[PDB]
């Protein structure tokens, strides 16, 4: 199954309650680690992370995250000087990797300024893609350090994947389980002469689900309204798909296909 590991960083200049720096790690949709400039401690966010990593792991990353926190504050100050920006602005980073079902891997590293893409790393060409000329200036500074680019490629292709496999084993009871969806079809005449069909699923894990409507065993032509895959709050998810008007709802989840004929 497709799994991923991601680390996020958020820096806020002159914040309102709101921390100046936040850093959170995720395995798929699950938070695994947290650090902020208020606590000044890296802590686990999943019990299976707390049970499998000794206190020395948390002590070491607490020190690293205090160092990275200061580097983030400084980078945001330089970005604001480049743009001649006053007041409160945000700076974000996302690093991570994916281990696909087919055995192939992906790695990514990107930054955002004020919630918009700023720099995107390409680990295959060892270069940064810049959105504007301030981003272009930072890119020239970062591309001048060949050792750092190579360091990032090795981390994304080897280290991150090894971290992901280790975290998958720790959290296997949560992350590798299957909770099949409970599917129902509801029929209702809405506006005079308009029948609405809703295909609704709930109680499933993982959140990835495929839902579609078919007419006489063939793919629809008319508009299907899709509902977001939402967390139910108990570790499971819910979703829906709807059409107006022989119709059948088709649902695929974790290698099991389901048909609900109307």
């Amino acid at each position, epitope marked *: 199954r497709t799994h991923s590991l991601r680390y996020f960083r958020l820096g806020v200049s002159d914040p309102i309650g709101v921390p100046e720096f936040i850093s959170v790690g995720y395995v798929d949709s699950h938070p695994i680690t947290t650090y902020d400039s208020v606590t000044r401690q890296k802590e686990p966010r999943a019990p299976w992370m707390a049970e499998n990593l000794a206190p020395d792991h948390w002590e070491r990353y607490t020190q*690293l995250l*205090r*160092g990275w926190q*200061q*580097m983030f504050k400084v980078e945001l100050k330089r970005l604001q000087r480049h743009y001649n920006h006053s007041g409160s602005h945000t700076y974000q980073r996302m690093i991570g990797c994916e281990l696909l079902e087919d055995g192939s891997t992906t790695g990514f590293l990107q930054y955002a300024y004020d919630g918009q893409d700023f720099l995107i790393f390409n680990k295959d060409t060892l270069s940064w893609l810049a959105v504007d000329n301030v981003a272009h200036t930072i890119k020239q500074a970062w591309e001048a*350090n060949q050792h*750092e680019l190579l*360091y990032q490629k090795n981390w994304l292709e080897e*280290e991150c994947i090894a971290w992901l496999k280790r975290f998958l084993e720790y959290g296997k009871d949560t992350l590798q389980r299957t909770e099949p969806p409970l599917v129902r079809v509801n029929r209702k005449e809405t506006f005079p002469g308009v029948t609405a069909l809703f295909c609704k699923a709930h109680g499933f894990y993982p959140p990835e689900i495929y839902m579609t409507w078919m007419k006489n065993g063939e793919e629809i032509v008319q508009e299907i309204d899709y509902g977001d895959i939402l967390p139910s709050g108990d570790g499971t998810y819910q979703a829906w798909a709807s059409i107006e008007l022989l119709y059948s709802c088709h649902v695929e989840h974790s290698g099991v296909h389901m048909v609900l004929q109307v």
Partner: antibody
Framework: QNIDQPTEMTATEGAIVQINCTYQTSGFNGLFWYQQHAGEAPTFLSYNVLDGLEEKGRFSSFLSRSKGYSYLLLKELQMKDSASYLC??????????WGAGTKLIIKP | GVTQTPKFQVLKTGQSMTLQCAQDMNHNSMYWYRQDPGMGLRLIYYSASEGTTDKGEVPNGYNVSRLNKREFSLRLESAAPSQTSVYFCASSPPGGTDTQYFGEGSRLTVLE
């Protein structure tokens, strides 16, 4: 966890010497080579993180990540090349693990 | 780059000592090591940034102070003959792939 390099090596002036370093670590984020003359401070020689040979004048450093192996190659040896050569690896937690070093003796 | 003092020191057992280290390269990470015959550099304490310090491999018998972004002091509260060694201060630039820059070293000899 562990870094191994020979205690001592002897080679003749004008010749070639290869200083081998093997490591067994939890993760890998880089390999450094440092030079340290007797009674002096260690100074940076090279850094490798991806596979290949990096040439810097008379010195070259090699890395094989799959074998967990590196070498420092010193060509056309000079008496001034007599020093200790320190191998260091960056582990999964970005901490440097230092090897005990190789004392290089050049026979004139 | 990295200024370390004193170069040499003779101490009597039980005596106090402070090793000073300064760098003006605007480095955020600072390290204290001891170098002993037959083994690699052993980290005593380190400072990832100004306002934080943590134990290395051999912190017993020592304590540190990251006084500001430039200075990182090493203290021997009660000098013991096992603390006879060569001490190195190093600093590293914000991030990397980046290398450590070493001070010249301090030879300490502790005698009864």
């Amino acid at each position: 966890q562990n870094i191994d390099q020979p205690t001592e090596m002897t080679a003749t002036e004008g010749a070639i010497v290869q200083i081998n370093c093997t490591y067994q670590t939890s993760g890998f984020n880089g390999l450094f080579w440092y030079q340290q003359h007797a009674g002096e401070a260690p100074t940076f020689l090279s850094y490798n993180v991806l596979d290949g040979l990096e040439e810097k004048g008379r010195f070259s450093s090699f890395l094989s990540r799959s074998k967990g192996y590196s070498y420092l190659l010193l060509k056309e040896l000079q008496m001034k090349d007599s020093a200790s050569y320190l191998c260091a690896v960056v582990d999964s937690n970005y901490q440097l693990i230092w090897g005990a070093g190789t004392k290089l003796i050049i026979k004139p | 780059g990295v200024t370390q003092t004193p170069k040499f020191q003779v101490l009597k057992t039980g005596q106090s000592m402070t090793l000073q280290c300064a760098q003006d390269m605007n480095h955020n990470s600072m390290y204290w090591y001891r170098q002993d015959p037959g083994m690699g550099l052993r980290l005593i304490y380190y400072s990832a940034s100004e306002g934080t310090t943590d134990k290395g491999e051999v912190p017993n018998g020592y304590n540190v102070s990251r006084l500001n972004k430039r200075e990182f002091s090493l203290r021997l509260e009660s000098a013991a003959p096992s603390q006879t060694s060569v001490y190195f201060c190093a600093s590293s630039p914000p991030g990397g792939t980046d290398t450590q820059y070493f001070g010249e070293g301090s030879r300490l000899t502790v005698l009864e």
